[PDB]
Design an enzyme around this catalytic site. Structure first.
Site, short mmCIF file in Angstrom:
data_model
loop_
_atom_site.label_atom_id
_atom_site.label_comp_id
_atom_site.label_asym_id
_atom_site.label_seq_id
_atom_site.Cartn_x
_atom_site.Cartn_y
_atom_site.Cartn_z
N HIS A 180 37.02 83.02 39.14
CA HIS A 180 37.54 82.86 37.80
C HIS A 180 36.55 82.07 36.95
O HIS A 180 36.05 81.01 37.37
CB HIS A 180 38.88 82.14 37.85
CG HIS A 180 39.49 81.95 36.51
ND1 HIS A 180 40.25 82.91 35.89
CD2 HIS A 180 39.38 80.92 35.62
CE1 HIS A 180 40.62 82.47 34.70
NE2 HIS A 180 40.11 81.27 34.52
N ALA A 221 43.59 79.22 44.18
CA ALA A 221 42.38 78.44 44.04
C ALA A 221 41.74 78.62 42.68
O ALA A 221 41.47 79.75 42.23
CB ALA A 221 41.36 78.79 45.14
N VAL A 238 38.72 78.25 41.74
CA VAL A 238 37.43 78.96 41.75
C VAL A 238 37.55 80.40 42.22
O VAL A 238 36.54 81.12 42.22
CB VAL A 238 36.35 78.21 42.58
CG1 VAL A 238 36.11 76.81 42.03
CG2 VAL A 238 36.68 78.21 44.08
N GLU A 239 38.75 80.84 42.63
CA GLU A 239 38.96 82.22 43.05
C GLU A 239 39.86 82.90 42.02
O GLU A 239 39.36 83.22 40.94
CB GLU A 239 39.45 82.26 44.49
CG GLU A 239 38.38 81.63 45.38
CD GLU A 239 38.63 81.78 46.85
OE1 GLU A 239 39.55 82.53 47.25
OE2 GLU A 239 37.83 81.21 47.63
N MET A 240 41.14 83.12 42.31
CA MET A 240 41.97 83.91 41.38
C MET A 240 42.67 83.03 40.33
O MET A 240 43.19 83.56 39.34
CB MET A 240 42.97 84.76 42.14
CG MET A 240 42.26 85.74 43.06
SD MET A 240 43.27 86.63 44.24
CE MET A 240 44.13 87.78 43.16
#
Ligand code: HEC
Ligand code: HEC
Ligand code: HEC
Ligand code: HEC
Ligand SMILES: [Ca+2]
Ligand SMILES: [Ca+2]
Lengths: 335, 335
Positions: A82, A122, A124-126
């Site tokens: 993201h 997370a 830094v992910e979704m």
């Protein structure tokens, strides 16, 4: 210099083949039949795995970082999620992940359903929330119909836990049977070249099997990265202490799950840090760090050739047709 | 009210059904035979369309922004590319794009091969160069083999032009036959509901076919967005003058290609600016801006229902297994 029968007999004592199909998971002595895989849950999980509306941006799906065309990985040093945020670790494959004892490089999730909750939330992910996922799904009647049928007894079928269970069911089918090594194991001498068999011999003789064994050539337990000698600062960044983050136990500093080497030829770059692009270099680092022997260039090339025979048949997945958004589906928020 | 036969005759005079299959492209008055589609070029173009290593980041493919499960679009107001950079325009679908007279919202590219060169090189999209694409491809023997076979009459088959030609061949197959409208047109009176037929009638009677006609219900020529009355500043941002950017002719100020309305129900949000999420609102804006008629809620709902009958069969695409990178494949540069 190659004895096929001897080689096969030694290999059968420490490795096994990937099964052709999966019909149940979580079979134990206590619950021998386990949890059945159902067509409805597999299909629902497939749709969810590919649906980038499960992220808050509307642009990131599991497939973004676990690309089914790239061996189930993203091929980057560490993942980018993201907002273009760069994460700390290299994305491992979901292929054959069902057979590993725990999930993530530090084993912090017990199984695939527990794991799947992590990327969703997370930053830094979704970068999403469980309730946003549920509200998104509930806004699309075809998704609701699917959940209601996939989890038929439940008053509240559209839940984050069931989202994770459906993804787990789909991922349990993402296995890679019939690699050249598995075909050799089953009796076909011609399935592997002489160089690949010299690599198999060297992998077994050198001591790699202490940590890379069973169906997945790894994935079953945890070891220091640097049992005998430390790898470099870029390969083992000082700030990622691995299992220590999970157990807070002194002996666990820089202890990581042994990587499952199935499909390793497809999933460069290597290690949790993703700075080693050449598989032969990863092989040399492992010998030096874990065993305290320097491999000759020939032994490293042979072992690298052998690791290629761990590439199995890659799943052939028709991209799902996703449910259409409706007027109250939450808007994408990439910015 | 509805006389099926007269309605069908009227519709046949201004629209056409999507063909069942494609076997040639770029059939013109000058060259009626066009260019044959080949299995080898289609397959190669599929691999390329899904390969995120065609971007400099290693993370963005055509499929990122033209998601085959979302009607060939990303479903965002405007696309987000390399570095999370937000672009100026909404991503249109590649489905049926082969039938349009020109490509992009301002028609700046003549065909799909010319178009494909744009996202590769754009900073806010794939942010790459033609030379890097060629060098990336050449580093992977499976790609080289495929290019040599797909372009057999050439000494230098692996070129950026041929990359674009292969993508074009693949995209030419991404057509959506057998929508409800097409089925009605072919003789099935029962294929459309009463309301959908009222929508069809209203679409033809109100004036929409002046700009939305032929096989794709648009895509063939250029018009002011605001022929009769200006839309709001959010819908028509002052800084995007459309075709004027291409021609530098002042008659082209805020002139855009008429949007092809195939699969429009799948591809919200609407217009080049992507700020209108509701199709019925887009329908009302078009009536007011282009025709000077205020539609009633019922007329807008009827037309919107009719536009749903333009959704065809969505391509069922097996995700390709991508060639494996080698030692000299250029490294991803997301950062
Ligand atoms: C990139 C931005 C990711 C997205 C989106 C998803 N995953 Fe991922 N995954 C990613 C990384 C960097 C890691 C390793 C993190 C660590 O601390 O170890 C993972 C891990 C997994 C695993 C574990 C496999 C293993 O350890 O062998 C699985 C099973 C997995 N991821 C699945 C998965 C699902 C189902 C996703 C959508 C809900 C998903 N991931 C998204 C990177 C990214
Ligand atoms: C336990 C003491 C080990 C021995 C003996 C060997 N390996 Fe290993 N390996 C081990 C761990 C804990 C890890 C993960 C380290 C990390 O934090 O990244 C690995 C990883 C690999 C890899 C990388 C795979 C990947 O997907 O990135 C490879 C290629 C590998 N190991 C190979 C290998 C070889 C050839 C060995 C014998 C010479 C060997 N390993 C021994 C743990 C242990
Ligand atoms: C998001 C970051 C994109 C990537 C990656 C790709 N495309 Fe795209 N595409 C995008 C936008 C925002 C636009 C509109 C730009 C404009 O100025 O009009 C497009 C346009 C197209 C088209 C034209 C379709 C039409 O006008 O009806 C096609 C055929 C298309 N894009 C294809 C395509 C290919 C083949 C890509 C990989 C090489 C690709 N796009 C990447 C957004 C993004
Ligand atoms: C020419 C003078 C037009 C007339 C008459 C109608 N439309 Fe149109 N339409 C036209 C253009 C130039 C565009 C693109 C405008 C832009 O810059 O975004 C469109 C677009 C649409 C859309 C949006 C589709 C999309 O994919 O975003 C819709 C739904 C639409 N047009 C419908 C529509 C209706 C229902 C009309 C009669 C009431 C109508 N249009 C007339 C050009 C012209
Ligand atoms: Ca890796
Ligand atoms: Ca749109």
């Amino acid at each position: 210099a190659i004895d096929n029968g001897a080689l096969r007999e030694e290999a059968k004592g420490v490795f096994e083949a990937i099964p052709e199909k999966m019909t149940a998971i979580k079979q134990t002595e206590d619950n021998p039949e386990g949890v059945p895989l159902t067509a409805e849950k597999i299909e629902l999980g497939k749709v969810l795995f590919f649906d980038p509306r499960m992220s808050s941006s509307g642009l990131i799906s599991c497939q973004t970082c676990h690309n089914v065309g790239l061996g189930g990985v993203d091929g980057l040093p560490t993942s980018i999620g993201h907002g273009w945020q760069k994460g700390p670790r290299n994305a491992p494959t979901m292929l054959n992940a069902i057979f590993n004892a725990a999930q993530f490089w530090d084993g912090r999730a017990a199984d695939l359903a527990e794991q799947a909750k992590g990327p969703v939330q997370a930053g830094v992910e979704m970068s999403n929330t469980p309730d946003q996922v549920v509200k998104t799904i509930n806004s699309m009647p075809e998704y609701v119909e699917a959940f209601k049928a996939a989890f038929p007894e439940e008053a509240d079928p559209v839940t984050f836990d069931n989202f994770a269970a459906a993804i787990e069911q789909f991922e349990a089918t993402l296995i890679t049977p019939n690699s050249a090594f598995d075909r050799f194991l089953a009796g076909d001498d011609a399935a592997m070249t002489d160089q690949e068999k010299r690599g198999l011999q060297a992998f077994m003789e050198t001591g790699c099997t202490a940590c890379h064994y069973g169906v997945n050539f790894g994935g079953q337990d945890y070891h220091p990265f640097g049992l005998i000698a430390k790898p470099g600062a870029e390969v083992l960044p000082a700030g990622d202490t691995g299992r220590f983050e999970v157990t807070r136990t002194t002996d666990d500093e820089y202890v990581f799950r042994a990587a499952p080497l199935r499909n390793v030829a497809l999933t460069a770059p290597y290690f949790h840090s993703g700075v080693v692009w050449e598989l032969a270099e990863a092989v040399k680092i492992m010998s030096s760090a874990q065993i305290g022997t320097e491999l000759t260039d020939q032994q490293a090339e042979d072992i690298t050739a052998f690791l290629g025979t761990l590439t199995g048949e890659q799943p052939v997945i028709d991209h799902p047709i996703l449910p259409v958004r409706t007027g109250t589906t939450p808007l994408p928020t990439p910015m």
